[PDB]
């Protein structure tokens, strides 16, 4: 027996939140990725570690559908 914690819903917009690079650099350095949430009987909005950039590399569903 075990338990897992999962966040799920519908994403209004899938776009990482850019921020200044802590090291002397250029371009865009993501500090957080805002993920929209939408579910029946409960709906919020949250942000995540920009490491999911590789996770969002291949989903092939829609623009934040489920």
């Amino acid at each position: 027996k075990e338990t897992k914690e999962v966040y799920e819903g519908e994403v209004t917009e899938l776009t990482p939140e850019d921020a200044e690079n802590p090291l002397g650099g250029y371009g865009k350095t993501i500090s957080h990725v805002i993920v929209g949430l939408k579910s029946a009987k409960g709906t919020k909005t949250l942000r995540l570690d920009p490491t999911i950039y590789e996770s969002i590399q291949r989903e092939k569903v829609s623009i934040g559908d489920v």
């Binding site: 209004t12 805002i34 909005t45 942000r47």
Partner: peptide, 23 residues
């Protein structure tokens, strides 16, 4: 050393309002 925590929390708090689909 501690001010960045408050800065991040408050900026996330203020960005959570307009991003919320309330209208």
């Amino acid at each position: 050393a501690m001010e960045l925590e408050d800065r991040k929390y408050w900026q996330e708090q203020l960005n959570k309002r307009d991003k919320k689909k309330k209208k």
